[PDB]
């Protein structure tokens, strides 16, 4: 009842792959951030540009919830001005990011015996991603001078690779669920407020 659907994002049964990260647009609702302080296992609750307590006392035109799954060691890459595979090829935040990055271990949900191969990441790309860019291309990466023509082989690699999460993997290689909340206050009246 007039409450923003944060539970649909955080409590989702399945999360998107990082290269195809899911975005939920939230507007015209009363946002209760208190329900997002509940989950203890939070590995990261890093907010840039705003204090967590002032969020309940602020109004924004829109909010965007970007959800995906990565490995633990890559959680540090979800932050302004970062480099690496995830930051450059899968999900990039702007240098002037205004929002909160939340990440928690999800080895219970996203790892399977024999490997969960449904979670993928982009390994090869011609250039770095722009902020909030989603590249879902499966085109063969031409790392050589010979055109690939869609054929995978030498100097022609498939751009996507699978994490293959297993429950016995080290904590740095275990799956982590990430939700990025971006608060947009642009040339328009605010529609999301805390109460």
């Amino acid at each position, epitope marked *: 009842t007039n409450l923003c659907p944060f539970d649909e994002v955080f409590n989702a049964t399945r999360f998107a792959s990082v290269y195809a990260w899911n975005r939920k647009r939230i507007s015209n609702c009363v946002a209760d951030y208190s329900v997002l302080y509940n989950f203890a296992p939070f590995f990261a609750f890093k907010c840039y540009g705003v204090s967590p307590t002032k969020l309940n006392d602020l109004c924004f035109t829109n909010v965007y919830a970007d959800s995906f799954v990565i490995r633990g060691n890559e*959680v540090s890459q979800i932050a302004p001005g970062q480099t690496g595979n995830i930051a450059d090829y899968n999900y990039k935040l702007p240098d002037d990011f205004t929002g909160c990055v939340i990440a928690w271990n999800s080895n219970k949900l996203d790892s399977k015996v024999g490997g969960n191969y449904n979670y993928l990441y982009r390994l090869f790309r011609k250039s770095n991603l722009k902020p909030f860019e989603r590249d879902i291309s499966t085109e063969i990466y031409q790392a050589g001078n010979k055109p690939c023509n869609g054929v995978a082989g030498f100097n022609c690699y498939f751009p996507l690779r699978s994490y293959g999460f297993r429950p016995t993997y080290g904590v740095g290689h275990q799956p982590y669920r990430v939700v990025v909340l971006s608060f947009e206050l642009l040339h328009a009246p605010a529609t999301v407020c805390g109460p």
Partner: antibody
Amino acid sequence: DVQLVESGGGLVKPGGSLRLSCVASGFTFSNSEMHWVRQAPGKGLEWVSVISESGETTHYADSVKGRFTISRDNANNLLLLQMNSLRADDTAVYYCTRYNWNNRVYALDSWGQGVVVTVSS
Amino acid sequence: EIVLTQSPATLSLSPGEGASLSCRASQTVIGSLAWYQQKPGQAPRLLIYGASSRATGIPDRFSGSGSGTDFTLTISSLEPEDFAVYYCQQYGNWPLTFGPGTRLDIRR
């Protein structure tokens, strides 16, 4: 052979701080996930903390989160546990141990001899 | 949090007898179930990982079995050095948890 040596413990007053250190030899420390486990006198084993091989991922037990910080220096084969705001409930033998999944040993196969930590007034 | 229960708390057996030690998990163990031995004044020693795989250098009189929430450590014939405390432990669920331990002592 594989050797882990812990130090930096001893007697400390409640609210004090300690910096436990573990020195590793005989294996590739930089490719080893490390844990701190503790054992109170007359009690069983209790997990304290974990740090990944690169140091980018850490996890803590609830009773120590916000007070303990685990870290590592791979160039010096060093594992560290900074313990602040110590309470009497932290009195224990602290073991540094390795989770050897990179060699398909999915358990804590290498343990140190442990270092005694006594928190008392 | 997976809570590990160990049965029985204390086991009195004679040398040469077989020993069976039980570890029960409050919920499914998705990762690895391990068994460790500890002697007074010493660090724990890994006996079994993956609930059935024997650690390097561990005598073959030690075996492990089980899955899900039920696990067993078996010692086919007890040697004098085998009378100690035994712990089970799970990896894969956080926090990492240990059972409270089972003490094996000599029956006389």
